Amino acid sequence: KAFDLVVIGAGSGGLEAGWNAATLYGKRVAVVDVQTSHGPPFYAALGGTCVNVGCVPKKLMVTGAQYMDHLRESAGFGWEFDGSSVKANWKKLIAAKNEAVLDINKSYEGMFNDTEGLDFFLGWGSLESKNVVVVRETADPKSAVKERLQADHILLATGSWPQMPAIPGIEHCISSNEAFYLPEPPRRVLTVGGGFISVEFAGIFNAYKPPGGKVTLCYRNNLILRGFDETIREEVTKQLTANGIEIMTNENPAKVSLNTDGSKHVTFESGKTLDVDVVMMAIGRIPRTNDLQLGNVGVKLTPKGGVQVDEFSRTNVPNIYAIGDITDRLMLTPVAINEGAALVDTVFGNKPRKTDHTRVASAVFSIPPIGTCGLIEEVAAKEFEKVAVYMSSFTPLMHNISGSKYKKFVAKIVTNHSDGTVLGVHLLGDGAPEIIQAVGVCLRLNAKISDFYNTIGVHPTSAEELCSMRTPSYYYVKGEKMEKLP
Amino acid sequence: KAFDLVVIGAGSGGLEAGWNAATLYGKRVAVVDVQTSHGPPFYAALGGTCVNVGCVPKKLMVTGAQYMDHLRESAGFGWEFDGSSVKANWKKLIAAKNEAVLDINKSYEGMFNDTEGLDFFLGWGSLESKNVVVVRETADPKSAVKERLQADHILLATGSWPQMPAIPGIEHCISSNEAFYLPEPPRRVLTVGGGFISVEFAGIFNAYKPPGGKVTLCYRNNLILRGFDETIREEVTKQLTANGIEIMTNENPAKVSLNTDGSKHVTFESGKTLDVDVVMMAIGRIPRTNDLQLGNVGVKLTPKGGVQVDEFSRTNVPNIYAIGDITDRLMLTPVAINEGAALVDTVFGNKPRKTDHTRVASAVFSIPPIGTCGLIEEVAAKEFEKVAVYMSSFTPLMHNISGSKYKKFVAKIVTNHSDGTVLGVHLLGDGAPEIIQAVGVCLRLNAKISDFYNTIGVHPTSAEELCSMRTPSYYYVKGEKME
Numbered sequence: 003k004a005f006d007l008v009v010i011g012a013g014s015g016g017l018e019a020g021w022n023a024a025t026l027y028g029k030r031v032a033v034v035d036v037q038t039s040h041g042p043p044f045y046a047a048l049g050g051t052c053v054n055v056g057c058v059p060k061k062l063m064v065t066g067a068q069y070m071d072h073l074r075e076s077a078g079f080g081w082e083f084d085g086s087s088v089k090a091n092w093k094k095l096i097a098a099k100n101e102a103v104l105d106i107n108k109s110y111e112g113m114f115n116d117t118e119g120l121d122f123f124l125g126w127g128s129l130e131s132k133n134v135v136v137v138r139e140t141a142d143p144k145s146a147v148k149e150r151l152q153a154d155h156i157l158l159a160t161g162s163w164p165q166m167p168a169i170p171g172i173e174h175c176i177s178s179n180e181a182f183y184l185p186e187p188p189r190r191v192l193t194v195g196g197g198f199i200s201v202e203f204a205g206i207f208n209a210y211k212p213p214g215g216k217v218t219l220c221y222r223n224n225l226i227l228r229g230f231d232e233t234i235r236e237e238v239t240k241q242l243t244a245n246g247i248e249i250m251t252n253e254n255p256a257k258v259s260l261n262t263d264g265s266k267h268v269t270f271e272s273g274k275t276l277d278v279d280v281v282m283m284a285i286g287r288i289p290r291t292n293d294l295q296l297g298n299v300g301v302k303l304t305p306k307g308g309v310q311v312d313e314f315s316r317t318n319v320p321n322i323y324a325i326g327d328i329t330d331r332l333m334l335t336p337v338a339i340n341e342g343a344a345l346v347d348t349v350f351g352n353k354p355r356k357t358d359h360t361r362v363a364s365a366v367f368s369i370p371p372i373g374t375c376g377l378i379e380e381v382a383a384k385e386f387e388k389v390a391v392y393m394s395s396f397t398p399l400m401h402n403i404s405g406s407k408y409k410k411f412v413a414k415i416v417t418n419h420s421d422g423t424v425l426g427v428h429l430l431g432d433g434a435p436e437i438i439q440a441v442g443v444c445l446r447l448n449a450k451i452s453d454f455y456n457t458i459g460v461h462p463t464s465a466e467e468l469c470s471m472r473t474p475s476y477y478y479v480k481g482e483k484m485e486k487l488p
Numbered sequence: 489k490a491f492d493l494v495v496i497g498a499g500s501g502g503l504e505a506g507w508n509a510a511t512l513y514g515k516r517v518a519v520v521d522v523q524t525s526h527g528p529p530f531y532a533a534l535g536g537t538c539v540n541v542g543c544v545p546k547k548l549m550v551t552g553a554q555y556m557d558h559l560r561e562s563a564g565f566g567w568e569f570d571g572s573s574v575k576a577n578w579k580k581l582i583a584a585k586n587e588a589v590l591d592i593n594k595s596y597e598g599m600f601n602d603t604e605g606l607d608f609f610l611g612w613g614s615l616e617s618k619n620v621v622v623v624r625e626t627a628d629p630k631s632a633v634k635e636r637l638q639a640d641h642i643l644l645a646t647g648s649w650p651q652m653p654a655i656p657g658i659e660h661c662i663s664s665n666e667a668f669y670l671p672e673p674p675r676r677v678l679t680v681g682g683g684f685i686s687v688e689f690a691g692i693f694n695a696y697k698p699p700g701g702k703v704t705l706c707y708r709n710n711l712i713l714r715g716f717d718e719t720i721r722e723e724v725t726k727q728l729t730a731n732g733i734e735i736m737t738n739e740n741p742a743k744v745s746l747n748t749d750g751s752k753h754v755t756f757e758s759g760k761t762l763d764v765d766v767v768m769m770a771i772g773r774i775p776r777t778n779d780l781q782l783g784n785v786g787v788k789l790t791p792k793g794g795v796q797v798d799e800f801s802r803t804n805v806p807n808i809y810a811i812g813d814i815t816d817r818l819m820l821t822p823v824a825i826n827e828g829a830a831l832v833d834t835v836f837g838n839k840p841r842k843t844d845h846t847r848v849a850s851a852v853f854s855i856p857p858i859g860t861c862g863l864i865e866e867v868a869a870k871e872f873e874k875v876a877v878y879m880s881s882f883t884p885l886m887h888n889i890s891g892s893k894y895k896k897f898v899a900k901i902v903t904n905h906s907d908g909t910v911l912g913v914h915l916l917g918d919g920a921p922e923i924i925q926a927v928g929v930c931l932r933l934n935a936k937i938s939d940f941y942n943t944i945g946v947h948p949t950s951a952e953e954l955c956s957m958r959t960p961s962y963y964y965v966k967g968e969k970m971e
């Protein structure tokens with residue numbers, strides 16, 4: 003019952019810290035989670051949100067959804083078949099995803115078995131005191147203690163949870179959690195939200211809808227994918243619309259009622275209505291702090307609800323740290339993992355390292371997908387006197403032949419024009435998430451535009467466009483956009 | 489007519505040089521090529537080998553071949569359709585490719601039309617004297633003179649040409665040039681060679697082969713794709729085999745004869761026999777210097793037939809330069825382009841610059857593909873006391889579900905273990921050519937393994953493997969491998 007490190011949440015951040023502490027520094031590690039494998043009732047499990055109801059199953063489902071485009075696009079390359087025989091079997095996809103995720107859950111059980119000191123505990127972690135975590139049978143703090151763990155160090159890694167707007171009929175709606183387990187593909191679906199989860203799921207549902215199907219994505223403001231490059235936001239909107247998805251912007255559900263046939267009658271704030279089979283809310287995720295009983299030891303939360311941390315993931319309470327989505331910053335698996343790896347290399351390695359939250363490569367598995375690293379030009383323009391924007395945008399040749407002429411590839415490099423330093427790279431098109439990874443390494447190395455354009459292209463690729471841009475398309479000078487420098 | 493620059497060959501390097509000299513440096517420029525659009529009889533044409541019978545059309549055709557895998561792989565993700573209705577219409581692929589290539593031909597025609605001081609001459613360029621290019625009707629130097637171009641400066645940019653082994657039946661075999669114009673997809677084809685062109689065409693033919701068809705690749709040496717990472721050579725051999733391609737290593741054609749039905753009867757040096765509809769020779773490309781009459785000016789050639797150049801692309805004759813494949817160095821379009829730009833910057837800009845032929849990112853559009861930049865470990869181990877190999881090899885998760893369990897992604901980083909400097913990155917799997925591009929920029933910036941590992945992954949990707957390797961898999965110490 004005595005551990006160097008007790009981790010609450012066997013997720014992206016929690017397991018990296020757990021496994022590292024044990025294998026690298028022969029530390030004695032306890033990890034708590036509420037469930038050992040994916041799905042209802044608690045959805046996240048051993049492996050965390052990404053593994054169970056996040057990056058992993060989503061990527062499999064987007065890959066499945068991509069075949070709608072491949073099957074059509076093949077005809078341009080001379081592939082012939084009975085188009086009238088094509089069916090998308092959602093049930094097959096969900097059974098395949100379930101088996102793939104279960105194998106990962108079991109893979110992690112294997113890890114915790116084949117690794118000394120590293121031990122898993124099942125049930126709900128909360129803080130008794132500075133150096134004791136209690137594992138209960140439920141999230142009710144009045145339920146039975148299963149174990150009481152002694153810890154020289156406590157890591158909060160409980161991740162996040164979908165936010166459900168408190169509207170009349172919210173109980174008729176789902177989150178991404180339930181989306182992963184729908185027994186049938188919805189004919190008509192409303193994805194609510196303008197973020198990556200709503201966009202990715204609109205693509206998934208769009209590919210698997212039965213005949214006479216319709217995917218509607220609504221977003222409360224004017225343009226989806228706030229925080230992404232503006233050119234790409236407008237382009238993804240176009241490319242989703244070109245593939246049959248209806249984008250309702252400046253619209254937001256005010257209430258949902260059940261129709262007598264079990265379908266959902268959505269009333270918008272604007273007074274518009276829409277009947278759908280599924281309303282999937284994807285309006286935000288919020289840190290999971292409630293259940294930890296942080297009041298007991300007085301861990302400070304933020305004006306937003308995330309565990310407040312310093313650059314070393316340290317709470318106001320010594321020996322207590324927080325990584326990943328509970329900190330309510332960048333909600334990404336590799337950031338959680340980076341933070342856990344840094345926390346452990348610091349505390350147990352005696353080799354203090356802090357996660358860099360700048361110049362983080364990330365993606366949206368939209369069809370086609372986004373790959374991005376570093377600053378969008380609007381943000382660059384407010385920090386740097388002179389910003390240059392290099393832009394190349396064209397339908398790649400293969401997509402003129404494929405018949406998907408609407409698949410414009412967008413490559414944008416944003417620089418500090420004073421020294422040529424690359425501040426951000428923004429890609430939209432097939433392979434963008436793969437292209438951007440090594441760009442993250444370039445930005446860590448303070449790559450300039452001349453490092454890109456003096457590197458020899460790989461031909462033919464979309465990526466080589468990044469090594470072909472010598473001349474700014476336009477500038478920001480003290481915030482002001484203009485074609486030419488003064 | 490008198491020009492600041494005359495370019496023989498309107499190809500990757502020749503057009504970069506001529507356009508740059510004309511537009512950036514305001515020189516009067518002549519460019520010569522033998523054809524204004526793709527295909528027989530001369531195959532290459534305005535635009536070069538890559539445009540007409542290389543990178544551009546082959547990438548379109550590999551993209552076409554990939555649908556064979558997508559169609560099969562769709563089933564794992566629940567896609568259903570009538571498999572027995574599936575046909576790979578090669579005629580449609582070829583017609584689509586020909587239109588794409590002709591559009592590029594037309595756009596280059598328009599470029600010459602619209603760019604003052606940049607003039608195109610049709611026919612066969614050769615050196616009359618060190619300041620005179622003669623353009624003639626045919627490759628025969630006694631053919632009719634169409635033009636005589638006076639040149640302060642002459643650029644040789646005629647590219648390379650398929651090598652055909654002087655064997656009995658050579659006339660019954662084709663090269664990549666003819667492969668691009670086969671009217672019908674061969675049922676049975678032998679690709680001869682272990683290089684990228686043989687492997688890439690084996691994958692193209694494997695996808696479009698009619699029912700009961702068979703693609704065979706043959707290579708003299710023990711393992712295809714010499715020059716590439718050895719783990720990738722072995723894995724790409726396994727993955728081609730898994731997709732139904734017969735890889736015959738340590739085998740070479742001795743002769744070819746016609747079966748009575750016009751099919752090709754192949755006798756290998758081993759006494760094995762194979763009957764095929766097509767024999768495609770992809771055993772090497774040689775520099776195209778024969779037709780240039782370089783003996784008229786005494787430009788120094790290698791016994792091979794390449795034009796010898798310094799690092800600034802200068803021949804032994806002042807005012808005569810050579811770039812691209814004719815130099816028989818790195819036969820890649822972007823290298824030819826880089827050499828042409830560097831030459832023109834040096835000569836007309838007084839901006840002295842030489843092409844770095846190290847750490848050049850390149851790809852093989854095999855199925856699945858290869859992306860690579862910098863040194864393989866065997867080469868690094870000879871030039872560095874201590875070399876570290878970081879290796880990750882895993883059947884990715886989409887490929888458990890897809891049914892292509894054989895499709896292992898291989899990511900390998902080779903370092904100078906003394907300082908961590910990355911010497912080489914080698915990738916096999918979907919996306920590798922796209923991933924490796926920005927790795928080229930990393931190696932220009934002297935990235936170390938710590939710069940990869942400390943970079944935050946993009947998840948889920950294959951690329952994030954590059955940023956997830958903390959610890960060497962093995963080492964070379966003084967040329968010796970140590971586990």
Ligand SMILES: Cc1cc2nc3c(=O)[nH]c(=O)nc-3n(C[C@H](O)[C@H](O)[C@H](O)COP(=O)(O)OP(=O)(O)OC[C@H]3O[C@@H](n4cnc5c(N)ncnc54)[C@H](O)[C@@H]3O)c2cc1C
Pocket residue numbers: 010011012013014015016034035036037044046047048049050051052053055056057058060125126127128159160161162178199290293294325326327328332333334335336338947948
């Ligand atoms: C639909 C979706 C798609 C996503 N796609 C991507 C993507 O493509 N790429 C990407 O980088 N990120 C993606 N993310 C984000 C990613 O899932 C998270 O950033 C990541 O999982 C956060 O890791 P973490 O360590 O903070 O916690 P998590 O991985 O969320 O782990 C938290 C764990 O703690 C457990 N837990 C919670 N409370 C308790 C308690 N009291 N006691 C015990 N255990 C508890 C939970 O059961 C859970 O397993 C996606 C998220 C979602 C929802």
Ligand SMILES: Cc1cc2nc3c(=O)[nH]c(=O)nc-3n(C[C@H](O)[C@H](O)[C@H](O)COP(=O)(O)OP(=O)(O)OC[C@H]3O[C@@H](n4cnc5c(N)ncnc54)[C@H](O)[C@@H]3O)c2cc1C
Pocket residue numbers: 461462496497498499500501502520521522523530532533534535536537538539541542543544546611612613614645646647648664685776779780811812813814818819820821822824
């Ligand atoms: C099948 C194949 C696939 C390839 N794939 C790739 C790939 O994916 N990526 C890559 O980077 N590289 C690839 N390459 C290599 C690339 O095509 C060459 O490296 C590049 O085209 C060489 O450029 P260059 O300027 O040297 O000559 P070229 O582009 O070959 O141009 C030479 C030109 O000169 C003309 N010519 C020749 N003799 C004369 C004469 N006497 N007078 C006038 N004109 C003449 C020819 O008609 C031709 O247009 C491929 C090559 C082949 C054969």
Ligand SMILES: CC(=O)Nc1ccncc1C
Pocket residue numbers: 347937938939941942957958959
């Ligand atoms: C590749 C790399 O940087 N690895 C590393 C990072 C931190 N601490 C130890 C190691 C071995």
Ligand SMILES: [Br-]
Pocket residue numbers: 709710711714
């Ligand atoms: Br060999």
Ligand SMILES: [Mg+2]
Pocket residue numbers: 113114115116117118119120121122
């Ligand atoms: Mg254990």
Ligand SMILES: [Mg+2]
Pocket residue numbers: 599600601602603604605606607608
């Ligand atoms: Mg002109």
